[PDB]
């Protein structure tokens, strides 16, 4: 993942569709269920490298169900500091009634899962194999 296209708009610190980058801070994470970072992007354009400063930078999060389509759903942190989600999980991205997808900014986006345990799980969606990291109780 590149920080060149990563929106940093921190102040005083269901369909996904498209989200303006002026109201997001930190990386935008989406789950295929494997974690994927989406960089700041022009409206149907090349990925821009402005740290989410420019007012035309958005996050193209257009979604279809994941076996042969885009990530399940995306999660991120917005400017005020609230966890904003979209789409459907595999609230947070749940692959199991007691298991979340582990990613670098999981603790920042969901601090309630700090005492969770990390396991190496396998999830089969469609016909493709995904070896991801899971945080469970």
């Amino acid at each position, epitope marked *: 993942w590149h920080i060149n296209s990563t929106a940093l708009n921190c102040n005083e610190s269901r369909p996904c569709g498209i989200v303006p980058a002026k109201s997001v801070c930190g990386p935008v994470y989406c789950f295929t269920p494997s974690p994927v970072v989406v960089g700041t992007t022009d409206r149907s354009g090349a990925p821009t*490298y402005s740290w989410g400063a420019n007012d035309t930078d958005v996050f193209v999060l257009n979604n279809t169900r994941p076996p042969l389509g885009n990530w399940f759903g995306c999660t991120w942190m917005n*400017s005020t500091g609230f966890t904003k989600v979209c789409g459907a999980p595999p609230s947070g991205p749940w692959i199991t009634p007691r298991c979340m997808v582990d990613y670098p900014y999981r603790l920042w986006h969901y601090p309630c899962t700090i005492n969770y345990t990390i396991f190496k799980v396998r999830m089969y969606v469609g016909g493709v194999e995904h070896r991801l990291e899971a945080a469970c109780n």
Partner: antibody, heavy 118, light 108 residues
């Protein structure tokens, strides 16, 4: 915390790596300036996320380190050549708007002279 | 990568007149994130104008920036002996390029 200080001047040989401390807050940055030449933008750094961006020119050999507790942002340039001989400045970005790294730098360090010669 | 062409190379004016510096760009600089700096010989740079129009703290009211898009202007209302130095413009994206600088010298 009236102003930040920088590391003392140092001289290195080609191929070596030099580190410059910057002791003093958000968005600490780095620039250099060759003798009698315009300023070149080096990578900036965020204390909140701990990850730093860099310019295209020297991205493969620049690393920005930061120290916990007291603000001691480091600056390490690998594979030095005769073109890197310049004075290096660290700077804090002031009065940050909505965007964290976008606002301009205000104060600067005293300046660390790095000489790359055999 | 953005390029920043400043005009003119060396400006020769007398104390009491007014200076007009230009910082022409090749691509639009995001939205007003452009900065201006002055550097006296033997010193670190100093932030004069930020956001193309706002003034920094302690900077006197003689300095004032303007412009938008690819053309920008910094104008010192009245030149005084402490204003003649080299000026650079600072831009909104990943390159974060600098200008080559303009020299302000006393016309004698």
């Amino acid at each position: 915390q009236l102003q930040l200080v920088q590391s003392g001047a140092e001289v290195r040989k080609p191929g070596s790596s030099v580190k410059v401390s910057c002791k003093a807050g958000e968005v600490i940055s780095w620039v250099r300036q060759a003798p009698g030449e315009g300023l070149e933008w080096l990578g900036v750094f965020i204390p909140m996320f701990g990850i730093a961006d860099y310019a295209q020119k020297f991205h493969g050999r620049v690393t920005i380190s930061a120290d916990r507790t007291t603000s001691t942002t480091y600056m390490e340039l690998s594979s030095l050549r005769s073109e890197d001989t310049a004075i290096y400045y660290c700077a804090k970005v002031l009065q940050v708007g909505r965007n964290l790294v976008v606002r301009p730098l205000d104060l600067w360090g005293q300046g660390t002279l790095v000489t790359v010669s055999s | 990568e953005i390029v920043l062409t400043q005009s003119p190379g060396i400006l020769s004016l007398s104390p009491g007149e007014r200076a007009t510096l230009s910082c022409r760009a090749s691509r639009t600089i995001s939205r007003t994130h452009l900065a201006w700096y002055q550097q006296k010989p033997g010193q670190a740079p100093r932030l004069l104008i930020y956001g193309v129009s706002s003034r920094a703290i302690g900077i006197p009211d003689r300095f004032s920036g303007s412009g938008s898009g690819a053309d920008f202007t910094l104008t010192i209302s009245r030149l005084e002996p402490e204003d003649f130095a080299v000026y650079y413009c600072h831009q909104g994206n990943s390159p974060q390029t600098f200008g080559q600088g303009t020299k302000l010298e006393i016309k004698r």
